[PDB]
Amino acid sequence: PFTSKDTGKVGEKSAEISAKDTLGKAVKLADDNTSLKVLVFFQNGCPSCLKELPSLDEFIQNHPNKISVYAINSIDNANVVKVLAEQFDFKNVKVLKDDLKITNDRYAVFATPTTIIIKDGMIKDRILGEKPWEFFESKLISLL
What we know:
Protein name: Thioredoxin, homolog
Radius of gyration: 14 Å
Organism: Campylobacter jejuni subsp. jejuni serotype O:23/36 (strain 81-176)
Keywords: Redox-active center, Signal
InterPro entries: AhpC/TSA (IPR000866), Thioredoxin-like_sf (IPR036249), Thioredoxin_CS (IPR017937), Thioredoxin_domain (IPR013766)
Pfam family, one: AhpC-TSA
C-alpha cells in the first residue's frame, strides 16, 4: 500500500517505513488500517519527549481506531531506544528504532523533532521543531 520511494514534502505520498520495535520486530504503516498516521522523528534529548509524545499517546487513547503514531529514533543505539521506550511506558505510541537511517533518509529528515502528519497516505503537514501541543492537536482534529 505504502511505497518505498523517497518523499517528505507536503502534498507528496507517504512512504513505508523501515524500523523495528524494542523486540526487534519490523513495524510497518500498513500493519494498522488507521487513516491518520503521525511520524515523530526523535532522539534522546529531543524536546518532543517532554509533551508532544506523551500528549499523542493520550490523544490516541481518546480516538482509538482513528490514529496511529510512530516515534522513530534514527540516532541512538538500540539499548538507548529500549530505555526510552521503557521510561515512556506508552500505551499506544510505537517507539521504534530506524533501520540504520533508512526511514530518516526516505523522509529527508535532517533534525529532530520532525513531525509528519499523514492522512489517507498523503503528507498533510511536515512540522520542523518543537511546537505547543495545541498546534499539533488542532491539525489532528481536522483530520479525524
